[PDB]
Design an enzyme around this catalytic site. Sequence first.
Site, PDB file in Angstrom:
ATOM      1  N   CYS A  33      -5.974   1.433  -4.425  1.00  0.00           N
ATOM      2  CA  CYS A  33      -5.423   2.178  -3.292  1.00  0.00           C
ATOM      3  C   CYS A  33      -6.465   3.210  -2.895  1.00  0.00           C
ATOM      4  O   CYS A  33      -6.643   4.229  -3.587  1.00  0.00           O
ATOM      5  CB  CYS A  33      -4.078   2.845  -3.599  1.00  0.00           C
ATOM      6  SG  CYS A  33      -2.677   2.231  -2.609  1.00  0.00           S
TER       7      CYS A  33
ATOM      8  N   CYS B  43       0.839  -1.198   0.000  1.00  0.00           N
ATOM      9  CA  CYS B  43       0.000   0.000   0.000  1.00  0.00           C
ATOM     10  C   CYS B  43       0.883   1.260   0.000  1.00  0.00           C
ATOM     11  O   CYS B  43       1.059   1.933   0.993  1.00  0.00           O
ATOM     12  CB  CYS B  43      -1.004   0.114   1.174  1.00  0.00           C
ATOM     13  SG  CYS B  43      -2.372   1.210   0.958  1.00  0.00           S
TER      14      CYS B  43
END
Lengths: 406, 405
Positions: B338, B160
Amino acid sequence: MNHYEVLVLGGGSGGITMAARMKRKVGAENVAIVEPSERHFYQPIWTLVGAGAKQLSSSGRPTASVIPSGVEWIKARVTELNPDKNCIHTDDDEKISYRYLIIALGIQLDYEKIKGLPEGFAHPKIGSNYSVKTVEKTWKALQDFKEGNAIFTFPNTPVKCAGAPQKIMYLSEAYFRKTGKRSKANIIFNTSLGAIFGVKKYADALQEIIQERNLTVNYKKNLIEVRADKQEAVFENLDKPGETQVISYEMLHVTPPMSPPDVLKTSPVADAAGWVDVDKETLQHRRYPNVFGIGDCTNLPTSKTAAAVAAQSGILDRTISVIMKNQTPTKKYDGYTSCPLVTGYNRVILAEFDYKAEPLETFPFDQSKERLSMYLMKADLMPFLYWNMMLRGYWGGPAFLRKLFH
Amino acid sequence: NHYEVLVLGGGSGGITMAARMKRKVGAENVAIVEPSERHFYQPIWTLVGAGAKQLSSSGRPTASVIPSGVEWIKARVTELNPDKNCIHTDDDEKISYRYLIIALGIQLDYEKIKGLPEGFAHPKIGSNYSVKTVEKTWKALQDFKEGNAIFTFPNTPVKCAGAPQKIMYLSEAYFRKTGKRSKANIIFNTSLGAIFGVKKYADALQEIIQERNLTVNYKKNLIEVRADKQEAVFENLDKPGETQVISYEMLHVTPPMSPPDVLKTSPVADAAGWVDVDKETLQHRRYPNVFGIGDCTNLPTSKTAAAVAAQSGILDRTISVIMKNQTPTKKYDGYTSCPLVTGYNRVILAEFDYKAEPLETFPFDQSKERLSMYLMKADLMPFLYWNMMLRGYWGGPAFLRKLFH
Ligand SMILES: Cc1cc2nc3c(=O)[nH]c(=O)nc-3n(C[C@H](O)[C@H](O)[C@H](O)COP(=O)(O)OP(=O)(O)OC[C@H]3O[C@@H](n4cnc5c(N)ncnc54)[C@H](O)[C@@H]3O)c2cc1C
Ligand SMILES: Cc1cc2nc3c(=O)[nH]c(=O)nc-3n(C[C@H](O)[C@H](O)[C@H](O)COP(=O)(O)OP(=O)(O)OC[C@H]3O[C@@H](n4cnc5c(N)ncnc54)[C@H](O)[C@@H]3O)c2cc1C
C-alpha cells in the site's frame, strides 16, 4: 398481479408472528405468507433433541396449523424482490404486489461450504443440531461414542443462537459423566471466535465451567473439511494463514457456515453484506419506506435468536401501525436478545443482554448462576408459550415482566 | 464452445493470468471473459483525485491489453456451474473449460448508501473509486471554500484500504498550498477502530495525523448522503441506533464493497461470496480445476494490485504443476503493498504479508515519507504495470528484496 395489503416473506418464527399481529391490524384476508416448507419448527429445542433429552417430532407442527386463520399461505419460494415496483417473484412464476412488505426469511445454512459436507452425514459419528436432517445424528453419535475426541465447531460467519454450539458440548460432557464414559473423552471446542462469549458476565461463568470440567477450547480454529469415512476433520488457523490441522474424532458436532438467504444476497433491499437494511431502532427499511425486516435476515446488530424476534415483533407492530397512520415511529428496539445457555441436563445459564452487550436480566436473581428454574423454563415453558402465545401474536419484549420483577 | 483455460475477468489478475497461461497452453486455448471496453490501472486514480495525474493516462482499450491470439468474449458471467465445468454469459452462451481462473475483482455498492449514486449529480462530493466520480473529487477540492472535508471508510472489505485516507493527506496538502488550510475542518470517519492494521505504518500515520491537526472519528460509518443539502449521516457502530448528521463542504465517499453478484450465490464461493481458494496455492478448496486471484478471492490479505502480482506468480506455478499431475509446493506469503501517499511529494510505502508484519523490499526504512516512493507510485509502477505485469513478467518481489539485503 396478485396483490395483498401486507405481504410476509417467510413462515418461520418472525413470519408467523408478524402475520398473526398484522391480521388484527388489517384483516386476515389482506395478509399473505410466502413459505415453501410444510413444517414449522421451534428450532431452540433441537439443542435438547441432539442431546437425547427431547423428541424431534414435538419440535414441529404443519405450517398450516400455525398460519393464522384466514391468512393466505402461498406455498412457494421467493426468487426476486423488486421493491421499486412493490412486487416480488416466486418460484411458481408468480408476481405478487404488496402495500407493505415484511421480510422474515431467516438465515441460510451452508454445509456445502465444508468440503465433504453434506455428504459426510451418511456416515456415523457426525451430527449437527442445526438441521432437521442431522440433529438426531448428533444424538446417535453421542450414544455410540465409545472412545476418543469429541469435537465441537463454530464457523467464521454470522450464526443463529451463538450459544448452541457450546450448549451441545456441555450436554455431551454431562452425558459422558452420567454413563461412565467421561474418562475416555477428550472434548474439544474449535471456535472461529477469540472469546467464549461476547457478554463478559456470562463469558466468566462459562469459563469457570470450562476449567472445572477439563474442556479444551482452541480459539481461531475454523473447520474447513470433513473426511467422514476416515472420521477425520480439518481446521484452519485463522491467526496464521496457510495452517491446517487434521484431527481424528469419535464424535463430531458441526455448526455450518451461515449467510443471508441467496435471494437477498443480491436484492436491492440488502446492505452490502446481504442482510435486510433496516433502521436499527424501528425495523423499517433504510431505503424503502414501506418495507420492514425482522429476525435473522436483518442487519440488526444483535444476536440472531427467537427471543430477539419476539421483542422485535412488538416494536415492528407499533412501527408499522403508526407508519400506516402517516406518523413518525416513536418506540425504539433496544437490541434485547437471550441465549439460554444449557450447561447440563438440569441447568441453564439464562443470558439476556441488549444492543450494548450488557446484561438486561428479567428476573431479580443472578442468572449467571447455573439454575434449575432456568432449565425447566427453556425445556418446557418456552416451547409451550411459543406455540400458544408467541405465534398467536401475544409475546413481545419481556420488558414488562422485567419491570414487574423489580 | 470449449477452452483449455477460461479466465473470468479482464482487469489486473485476469490479463495477468491470461498472459501467463498463454505461454503454458498456447494462446489458442485461452480466453478472457470481460464486458468492459476499457481496462484501468486503478491505483493512479488516487493522484487523479488530487489532480496530480490524468484520468486518460489511467486506462487503455481492453483490446490493447489482451495478449495476442487470446479470445476476448465481450460478455459478462451470469452463472458458474463448476460441477459441469461450465459458465453462462449474458448473451445466453455456455462456455466449457478444463481450468478456470476467476478474476472478477470487487464490486462497488454505492447504492447501499441512501442518496447515492444520484447525489453525485451535485457538487462538493466525489469518490476516487469510480471512473464516473474520481474527477468530481478533484473539483470538490478546487471548489472548496469553507467548512468540513469528510473522508469515509465503510463497514465492508475494500480494495486498497489505504486509499481512503491517501486522498485526505493530499487534500490537506492542497488546502495548505492554496491558502485554505485555516478554514478547513478535515475529518476521517471510519468504520474501523484503527488508522491502519500494521503497527509500523499506523504509528507513522498517527504522528502525521497529530502533526497536521487531522481528527479521526472511529466506528462511524456513512449511511446517507443528502447532496441537495450538503449533509452526510453516520451511524455509530459502537452504539447501535445512534446517528449523526454532518454538513460538508467536501465529501469523499468510499463506497461499501462486496463480491460480484454472480459470485455471491455461486457454488464456488464461501458463505460470504468470495472465491473459496487455498490460502497458499490459490487452487479452489472444493473444485480442483478452479483457481482464483485478486480481489474476488477470500485470500486474507489486502486486496491490492501489488497482491495480484505476487499471487500471479504463485498461481502460475500452481497451475503448471497441476497440469503435470504433481502436487503444488510454492506457497503464497500474503504479500501486498500500500503506497500510502502522504502529500504531493512523499509516500509511506507499506509492504507486509499474512502476518500483518512489515516485509519491505528496500533496505532503508519505509515508514519514512520518501520522495522516491512517490515517484515509484506515480510514474514507475504505472509504467511497470502496463509493460511487465499485464504481459506476465512481474510477480513476487521476493528476489528483488533478497538482492538488496
Ligand atoms: C440448534 C438451534 C438452537 C437454537 N436455540 C435458540 C434458543 O435457545 N433461543 C433462541 O431465541 N433462538 C434459538 N435458535 C434460533 C431461533 O430459532 C431463530 O433465531 C429464529 O427462528 C429466527 O426466526 P426467523 O423468523 O428470522 O427465521 P426462521 O424461524 O428460521 O424462519 C425463516 C423461514 O424462511 C423460510 N424461507 C427461507 N428462504 C425462503 C425463500 N426464498 N422464500 C420463502 N421463504 C423462505 C424458511 O423456510 C423458514 O421457514 C436456535 C437455532 C438453532 C438452529
Ligand atoms: C482508487 C484506487 C487506488 C488503488 N491503489 C492501489 C495502490 O496504490 N496499490 C495497489 O497495489 N493496489 C491499488 N489498488 C487496487 C487495485 O485496483 C486492485 O486491487 C486490482 O485492480 C485487483 O485486480 P482484480 O483483477 O482483482 O480486479 P480488477 O482489476 O478491479 O478488475 C476486475 C474485472 O472483472 C470484471 N468483471 C466484474 N464482474 C464481471 C462479470 N460478471 N463477468 C465478467 N467480468 C466481470 C470487471 O469489469 C473488471 O474488469 C487501488 C484501487 C483503487 C480503486
